Design a protein around this nucleic acid. Sequence first.
RNA 1: GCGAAGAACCUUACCAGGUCUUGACAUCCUUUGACCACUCUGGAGACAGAGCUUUCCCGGGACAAAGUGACAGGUGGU
RNA 2: UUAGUUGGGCACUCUAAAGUGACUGCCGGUGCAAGCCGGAGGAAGGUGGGGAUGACGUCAAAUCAUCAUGCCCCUUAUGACCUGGGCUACACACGUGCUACAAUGGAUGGUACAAAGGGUCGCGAAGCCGCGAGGUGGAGCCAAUCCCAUAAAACCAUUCUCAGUUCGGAUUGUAGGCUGCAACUCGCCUACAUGAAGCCGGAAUCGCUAGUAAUCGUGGAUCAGCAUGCCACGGUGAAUACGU
Lengths: 154, 60, 96, 81, 126, 102, 109
Amino acid sequence: MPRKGPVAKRDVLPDPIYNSKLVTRLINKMMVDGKRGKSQAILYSAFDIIAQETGKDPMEVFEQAMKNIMPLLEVKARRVGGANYQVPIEVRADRRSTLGLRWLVNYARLRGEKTMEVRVAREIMDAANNTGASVKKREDTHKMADANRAFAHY
Amino acid sequence: AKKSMIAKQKRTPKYAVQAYTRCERCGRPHSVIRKFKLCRICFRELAYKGQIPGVKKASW
Amino acid sequence: KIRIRLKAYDHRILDQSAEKIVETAKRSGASVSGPIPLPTEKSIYTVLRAVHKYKDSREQFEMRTHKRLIDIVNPTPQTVDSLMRLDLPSGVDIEI
Amino acid sequence: RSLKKGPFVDDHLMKKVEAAAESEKKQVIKTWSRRSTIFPTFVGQTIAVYDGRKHVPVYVQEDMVGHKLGEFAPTRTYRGH
Amino acid sequence: QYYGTGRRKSSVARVRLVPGDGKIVINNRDWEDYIPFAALREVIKQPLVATETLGNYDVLVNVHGGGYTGQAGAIRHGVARALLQVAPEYRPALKSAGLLTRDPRMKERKKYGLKGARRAPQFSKR
Amino acid sequence: MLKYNIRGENIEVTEPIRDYVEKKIDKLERYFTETPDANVHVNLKVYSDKNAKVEVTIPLPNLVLRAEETSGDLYASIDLIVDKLERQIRKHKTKVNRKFRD
Amino acid sequence: IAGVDVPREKRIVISLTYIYGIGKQTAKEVLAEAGVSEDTRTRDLTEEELGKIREILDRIKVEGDLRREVNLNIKRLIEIGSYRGMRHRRGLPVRGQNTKNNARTRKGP
RNA sequence: GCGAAGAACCUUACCAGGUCUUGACAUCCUUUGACCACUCUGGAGACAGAGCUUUCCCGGGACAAAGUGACAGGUGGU
RNA sequence: UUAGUUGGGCACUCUAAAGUGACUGCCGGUGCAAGCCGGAGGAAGGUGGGGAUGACGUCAAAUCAUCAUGCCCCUUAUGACCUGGGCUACACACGUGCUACAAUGGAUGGUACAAAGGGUCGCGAAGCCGCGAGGUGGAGCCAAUCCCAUAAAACCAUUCUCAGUUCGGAUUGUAGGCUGCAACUCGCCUACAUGAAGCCGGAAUCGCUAGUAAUCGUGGAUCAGCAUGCCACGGUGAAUACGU
Ligand SMILES: [Mg+2]
Ligand SMILES: [Mg+2]
Ligand SMILES: [Mg+2]
Ligand SMILES: [Mg+2]
Ligand SMILES: [Mg+2]
Ligand SMILES: [Mg+2]
Ligand SMILES: [Mg+2]
Ligand SMILES: [Mg+2]
Ligand SMILES: [Mg+2]
Ligand SMILES: [Mg+2]
Ligand SMILES: [Mg+2]
Ligand SMILES: [Mg+2]
Ligand SMILES: [Mg+2]
Ligand SMILES: [Mg+2]
Ligand SMILES: [Mg+2]
Ligand SMILES: [Mg+2]
Ligand SMILES: [Mg+2]
Ligand SMILES: [Mg+2]
Ligand SMILES: [Mg+2]
Ligand SMILES: [Mg+2]
Ligand SMILES: [Mg+2]
Ligand SMILES: [Zn+2]
């Protein structure tokens, strides 16, 4: 019942070396307990594997990896009288990027290899090739949302 | 059983380890500050009265 | 070649009493440096507010002490007597 | 005394058994000091140690040297639930 | 000359600026060592990149206090205040990025009945 | 499976009293077909003018059951404290089911 | 091999600690008096190296002899009547720690 | 992780054993005015028996020696 | 000068007294007015951030045990002294915390960066000894001067290679240190060895909106000794808020 609605949003600083916004927002996503050095370093070294394994562009390939896992639709369930109906709805521009990084890192921890260094770098390779767990979940979101297209606006 | 207890604490004990501190006004054993030799209750009730120099309520 | 240490709970007495020394000292011992405001030392005492229960409700008290410093370079025969004569009130402690 | 300055032995307990060597386990010793380490001189003697409400007799062996008197006089009375 | 003493958190950084090549001196120690992170290194040059003077002046820094990031923030404010003294014509440029402002964020105080600044002990219904 | 805890003050918690409290509050199981195991807080106190008090708290997950009563003797209060508790279970359960069925 | 089978893929500093009565720190001296480097695989030491270690480890106590000594000490306390005997004989915590809660590592499940 | 901002003896308010009855703590009684402390013995200690000393200061005094009363003392209940 | 050291100077920080500064002050739009939206100046803009401050009253809420006190009760004891024991028990149930279940990690070596406090029957350095907890020693300090007091995470190199293990440390045997007249019931710490449950936790449930949560160290009260509790200090430092 309370609350005034819209609120301000945090800023992002342009990181050196790989000047980008997604990179800076990715560093803070996989950081734990405020250790910037640990989280930042594994990302910078991970881009080396991106160059050595399949060298196209460290700035690129990461790009379309994001634009291949960011969802287009979304489900925001609501409870109606008698039964709860999963209502499909669009995804805003800001949450478009947020749901990408979170899905990237949740399944980068579950990859199952020796180091987080390899695991994160390999995962974006699979996404850049329309494969992997991160790509898989977005299809689940789309399949479920498009299955309930009936009461989309109604 | 307190008048006996206060008198007991005044006189010197068998060894230096038996000795301890007691509140001067009331005489409770727990929570005594040896800067003032008052317990936490007598300290509050008498600091409000403006009789402890320097002591004032702390906002920050 | 004489230093003066002043401490007080209330600076209003301290600053006023400190000024009295400065005027009197320069009468004979003109070589007097200005008072130096040495850092104040503070202590807190958090106390349970209630009597029996309620450890979550407490109360905090403080004790701030202010200090000053007076330095004299070239003394005079009456400067010590002048310092001796000037007796500051209570609430301030002097120390030559 | 758990240090180099030890060991600690109670005076009135130590002196009583010292003059009881002529008895040679002929008299029970009734003492309260539980904080005395058992000496070699105590071996073979029987001492009654206060357990908080009464005196319990213990016969000193050679294996008991270096321990305290109270170790062989249990205080809390536990019998299960 | 060009004193631009700036602060951040618990850090105070007194910076004297002189024309030169671009060498940075911190407590008589090379600045490659004192600031290890290259990410922390770019922010030092923000007042020197809005105005094209990066390869023209030498900074002599005598910082004291605060954590390693704390001196990095306080030295950014240090040069900007000193650089603004060099020429007032840079004020609109630096103000746009918000570099003259001294950040007001400080660590809070602990409160009684709480396990920190705002952390509350676990509540049990029954 | 309910676990009890009686805080007897100014009174002795005799075994017959313990059995009486346990068996009377045990019939609430019929209503709430899955009562997750929870702790019951029961308080008893008697005044100088022969008045008895009972307080019951049964923190079910979404159901905070309470009732407090004052009567003549101890047994009347316990028998009269079921009515206040049974009302709340019937109030809370039938509120959820019928409203979501418009 | 050295009293009992030790791991092969492991390292001599780590493999030795697989016998009762030896530990990480003590493995530093037995690898020092043997004059052999710490970073050596177990399936690399020669007979001359392995011979010195067995000679060095002979002086220190090992399994069996140490296993029986500690049990003998435990037995000595059971019938002497010492307080620790009833703790050992009943399985309750022996040293000075409480029993109202948190004594499961010795009492069991 | 509440009174308890610190339970090995003390704290301690509980229990066992060993002890005292104007009393451990204040007022008014009366004789001396310092009163003790210490060493030895029995001592678990409290306490029982002996010796050295108790020097008050200025008719005043506070304490202490000695027995009596008025009296004291209760962390006993609401 | 080995070192801000010494000589020298308050230039800068710094400490603390007195002042300025933020008041919808100004501008534009909107409104009739309160006001609302945006913008400039500024370090700070809309009660800037945080504290102290808790109206009439409700719960016969808690405290006769901090203190006081009506009435009732005891008084060769329900008052007074001493030693020993207990408040530390244990088939079990619940609440609040600490440590983990490892590779963003363990181990080894090098090194940088704080704030806030305490110290006279007190803090206790250098030096020497011991693997260690610690011992001798006595400098300086009634302290912006000396001590407590080397901050830790972080950074840089090597190694371990996904296992109940070089993870985890409970538990236990032996040998020690320190306080105290005294460490068995019943203290803390050190050395060697033993090596348990535990590989992310069911139903359910808790905290938090920015220097916050999260994480890492530091100090103080009580204190001869003893805190994973309490009260304060700083280092690094997020994600999200469509909306009712
Ligand atoms: Mg003590
Ligand atoms: Mg509560
Ligand atoms: Mg009925
Ligand atoms: Mg303990
Ligand atoms: Mg709490
Ligand atoms: Mg006692
Ligand atoms: Mg005599
Ligand atoms: Mg005598
Ligand atoms: Mg206007
Ligand atoms: Mg504005
Ligand atoms: Mg107000
Ligand atoms: Mg009531
Ligand atoms: Mg009550
Ligand atoms: Mg009373
Ligand atoms: Mg307790
Ligand atoms: Mg380990
Ligand atoms: Mg012990
Ligand atoms: Mg070990
Ligand atoms: Mg298992
Ligand atoms: Mg595993
Ligand atoms: Mg301590
Ligand atoms: Zn008091």
